[PDB]
Structure formats: structure tokens, C-alpha cells
Amino acid sequence: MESADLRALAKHLYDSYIKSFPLTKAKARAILTGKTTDKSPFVIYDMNSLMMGEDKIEVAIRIFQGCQFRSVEAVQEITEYAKSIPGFVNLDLNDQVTLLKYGVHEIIYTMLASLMNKDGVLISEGQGFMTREFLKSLRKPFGDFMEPKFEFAVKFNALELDDSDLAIFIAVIILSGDRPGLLNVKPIEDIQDNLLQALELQLKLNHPESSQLFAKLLQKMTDLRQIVTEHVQLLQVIKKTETDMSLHPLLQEIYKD
Amino acid sequence: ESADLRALAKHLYDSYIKSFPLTKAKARAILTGKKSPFVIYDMNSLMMGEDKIKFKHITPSKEVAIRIFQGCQFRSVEAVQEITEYAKSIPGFVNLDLNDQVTLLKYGVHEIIYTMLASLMNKDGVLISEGQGFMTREFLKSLRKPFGDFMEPKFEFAVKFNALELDDSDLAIFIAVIILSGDRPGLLNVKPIEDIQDNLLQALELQLKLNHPESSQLFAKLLQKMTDLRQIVTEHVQLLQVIKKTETDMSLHPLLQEIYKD
Numbered sequence A: 001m002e003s004a005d006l007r008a009l010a011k012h013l014y015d016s017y018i019k020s021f022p023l024t025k026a027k028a029r030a031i032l033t034g035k036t037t038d039k040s041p042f043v044i045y046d047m048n049s050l051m052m053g054e055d056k057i058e059v060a061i062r063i064f065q066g067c068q069f070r071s072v073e074a075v076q077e078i079t080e081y082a083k084s085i086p087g088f089v090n091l092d093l094n095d096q097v098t099l100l101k102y103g104v105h106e107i108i109y110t111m112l113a114s115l116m117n118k119d120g121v122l123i124s125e126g127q128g129f130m131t132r133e134f135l136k137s138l139r140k141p142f143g144d145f146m147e148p149k150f151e152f153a154v155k156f157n158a159l160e161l162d163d164s165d166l167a168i169f170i171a172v173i174i175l176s177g178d179r180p181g182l183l184n185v186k187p188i189e190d191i192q193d194n195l196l197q198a199l200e201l202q203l204k205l206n207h208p209e210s211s212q213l214f215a216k217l218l219q220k221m222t223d224l225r226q227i228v229t230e231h232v233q234l235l236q237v238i239k240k241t242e243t244d245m246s247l248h249p250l251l252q253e254i255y256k257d
Numbered sequence B: 001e002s003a004d005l006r007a008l009a010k011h012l013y014d015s016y017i018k019s020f021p022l023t024k025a026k027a028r029a030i031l032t033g034k035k036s037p038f039v040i041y042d043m044n045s046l047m048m049g050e051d052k053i054k055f056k057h058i059t060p061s062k063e064v065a066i067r068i069f070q071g072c073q074f075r076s077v078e079a080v081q082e083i084t085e086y087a088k089s090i091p092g093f094v095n096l097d098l099n100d101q102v103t104l105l106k107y108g109v110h111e112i113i114y115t116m117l118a119s120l121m122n123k124d125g126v127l128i129s130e131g132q133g134f135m136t137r138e139f140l141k142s143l144r145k146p147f148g149d150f151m152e153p154k155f156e157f158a159v160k161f162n163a164l165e166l167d168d169s170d171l172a173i174f175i176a177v178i179i180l181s182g183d184r185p186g187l188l189n190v191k192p193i194e195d196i197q198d199n200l201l202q203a204l205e206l207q208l209k210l211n212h213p214e215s216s217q218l219f220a221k222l223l224q225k226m227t228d229l230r231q232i233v234t235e236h237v238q239l240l241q242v243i244k245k246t247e248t249d250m251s252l253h254p255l256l257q258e259i260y261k262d
């Protein structure tokens, strides 16, 4: 509740975010906006360039399983980040699991936007870039499975958050007391209150010209919840068609209920 | 500009009182028990309560679950017009593109009906007919088939929402914020809608700090509820669709159906 403690918490989370996540938004922007010989990605815009990209860095399935492995890794990274949020490891262990179970999808989407612009997405730790038009043109349900991610990202990126902002935002998401099946909501909300205070001051200091950015950022948690729902519904339709295709137990478990 | 935000707060409060039949303050007095309302807890008391209150929605389907459902519909159609009138008092609203006004109201009214419905609810039931009646949660939940499960989610929301302990001066501003959502589909001119919503958000922030100084980050917590609102409105629509496809005894006069179309 004291400015200095809120700034200290902001610094702590930012520092920890850098440690836990391989590719920051600042790095991603440097690659995407280019003007750099050294950080230049190989671009995959069609089938042949895919085949060449593998030598450098069914198609829809292989891409799908690519995103799946990355998402598993992201869960791992988010889980490590979560442990650094003051108070989190002290909560009831079941609550820790529940907070992660419901939080990871929202966070993956949020952080995926950092790697995206209107025309595509960074892959393989920035070494590649796959175009939106290619992903959208994948067959059957897969094309329409890729595209909504971009639609979110374009909207979210318009807020122009930097990493220091996202570190605190991602923490707020995890510490949601409104998750189903939580045993002890009160200690969760007490932490979230501190995170929200930290986020509000961060945004006022780091974006003084951007009125009510705090409120606008929270209104995005709405867009996140909706898109996670569509995501799950779309995956289920895929499993029922693609009985050959399989999901990591970790994701299977997250999806359960 | 604090003064302008307070002015905006009072302007909306004043208009909210004029537009809505039963304030939250009055509804709380009735519910906590502080002209006892007629209580509907079962079939027989329903039959008496209409012959006593004369609900204006009772129209030549005989089945009870359906007639309660249709009663909620009738009331929701009235609420739309009340919300539409209230909207017209929000500074800047009537100056928006006319199609955008229609779009905002079309996509807002559901979220606003849910929010305000909570004002009339506690854990045990809901006020009806300007607080002259009270129908129990248990009775609503115990209606057959899809109807019981259609009613209960509204209470589940209300109980959670009411825990924030907003009063009418708070809600007046919150309701305005909902209406002025720039992310509605099909909006032609988003900028002026977000400009107004920014002023309303400022007003709500200051209102909540002043009116609830002890309740830290209540602003944030209220905005988080817009999440819960969007979700439940989605479920709501999906539940209606299942009713229309299922209930072969839900036919009405085409003019009625037309009135209830949205």
C-alpha cells in the first residue's frame, strides 16, 4: 500500500519475468521491426518455405503439434514465474493447482500477442516467423483454430504494454479469487489487491499520457476469458475428428473440466 | 476536474432514480425486513399471488414453469425500455451515430438486466412487481426440465455480485460504463464511445474511493465482474436456444413473439 513497496514489487516481478520467459516482448519487437542484420528471422509463408525452414532454423498436424509442444513449455515457464509471486507458494496446495489450471491459458494468449503482429508470429525463440495468411490457410478446422489468436493479439497489442507492465498483469491473472473450486479465496484476493495496486501505479508512471489504461487493461481480461472458452470448444471438435492426434497429459489435465 | 466527475456522478444518480421503478436501497429495505410483500414459494401461492397482485403478463400455455418464464420475459422487455431511457441521459450518448446507439443498447441490455436484477435478489429469492411480491429461489430452482436450471445461475451471479455491496449511486455509473463499450460488434465510430467511457470510468473510480474508502481496489474488482457478466450472458443465450428448439408448447400469438424477438 506504500508507493515504495509497490515499486519494489513491480521491480521484483519484472526481474522474475525476465528470468522465467525466454523471449521478451522487447526482443520480439526488435526482431519484428527488423532494422537489424543479426536478429533476422527465416519466414515461412507456404509449404516449400516450411520444408526449407526446418533445414535452416500432414502439414496442419505437424504445425499443430508444434504449437502444442511450445504451449507445454509455456505452462512450465508460467508455473516457474508463479512460484516467484509473493504469497503464491504459501497458499493451499490445491488452490495453487487450481489457480494455474485456470490461469495458464489466459496467460499463453496474453504473451503470445507479444510475439505477434498483424502479419504473423515469431517461432523457435525468434529464429523463425510464420505468416498469418499461411496459418489461416491450413485445412479443415486448423486454419480457423490459428486465426482467433491473431485477432486477439492485434487488439491487445494496441495498448502498447511493455514487459514491465505484462509481468504485473500476468500475476493479477494468476491470483484470481473467482476461479472454480478454490478452497480459500480470501488470501488469494489479498495478494491480488497488492498486485492490482502495483499494476495501477506501474501504468500511471510508465504510461502517464494513457488515461484509464488500468481499466482498459482489466477489460481485456474479458476478451481473454471468452477466447479461452472458444479455444477449448474448438479443440474438442478437433479431437472428435482427428482420432490419430494426441495431446500432452499436462494439457489434457488442464482441459479436464 | 474532481468536481466534473462528482457532477457527472450526481447527474447519473439523479437520472437512475427517475428511470428505474425500484431502487436498490428500497429493495434492500424490503428484503432485510426493515408492507410485507406477498410470498410465492409454491404452486398454490403462485395461483393466489396473481389473483392478488394481478401480474400484467398473464395471457390466454397453462404449465407453471412456462408462465413464470414468460413473466421474466415480459419484465425484461420493460427493463430494456427503462435502460434505453436512462442511456439517453448519459452525457454524449444521444450525439453518437444513431446506428451506434442502437448497437450499444442491443449488446448492453442483457448485461445490465443481470446486474440490476441482483439489486432485487438475495440468497433466498427475488422481488417482483416493484417489491410487492417475493418469489423464492427454491421454488424457481425446482421448476422442471430446463427451467429450474435456467433460473438458478441468476441467483448464483447475484449472490457473488451483491457481496461488493454497491449502492445505487455506484451502480448508476457502472451501468453507464457497460453501455459505452467500444468493443461491441458493428460499431461505426468507436472513438467517441471510448472517450465517454473514459470519463465514466474516471467518475466511477472517484465515486468508489469516496463512497467506499475502506474497500481497497473495489474499482478493479467491479471491472473484473464484467468478465462474469459476459460469460453468463453467453450461457444465457445458449440456454434460450435450447428452450426454443425443445419446447413445442411455447407457442404464442405472432405479435407477442414479435414483441419478444430480441
Ligand SMILES: COc1cccc(COc2cc(C(=O)O)ccc2-c2nn(C(=O)c3c(Cl)cccc3C(F)(F)F)c3ccc(Cl)cc23)c1OC
Pocket (backbone or CB within 6 Å): A062, A063, A064, A066, A067, A068, A069, A070, A071, A074, A105, A108, A109, A111, A112, A115, A121, A122, A123, A124, A130, A135, A145, A146, A149, A235, A251
Ligand atoms: C511449428 O510450430 C509453431 C507454428 C506456429 C506457431 C507456433 C508458436 O505458437 C505458440 C507460441 C507460444 C510461445 O512462444 O510462448 C505460445 C503458444 C503458441 C500457440 N499455442 N497455440 C495453441 O493452439 C494452444 C494455446 Cl494458444 C494454448 C494452449 C494449448 C494450445 C495447443 F496448441 F495445444 F492447442 C497456438 C495456435 C496458433 C498460434 Cl499462431 C500459436 C499458438 C509454433 O510453435 C513453435
Ligand SMILES: COc1cccc(COc2cc(C(=O)O)ccc2-c2nn(C(=O)c3c(Cl)cccc3C(F)(F)F)c3ccc(Cl)cc23)c1OC
Pocket (backbone or CB within 6 Å): B067, B068, B069, B070, B071, B072, B073, B074, B075, B076, B077, B079, B110, B113, B114, B116, B117, B120, B126, B127, B128, B129, B135, B140, B150, B151, B154
Ligand atoms: C413471474 O414473473 C417473474 C418471476 C420471477 C422473477 C421475475 C422478475 O425477473 C426479472 C426482473 C427484472 C427487474 O425487475 O429488473 C429484471 C430481470 C428479470 C429476469 N430476467 N430473467 C431472464 O431470464 C432474462 C435476463 Cl436475466 C436478461 C435478459 C432477458 C431475460 C429473459 F427473461 F427475457 F429471458 C430472469 C431469470 C430468472 C429470474 Cl429469478 C429473474 C429474471 C418475474 O417477473 C416479474
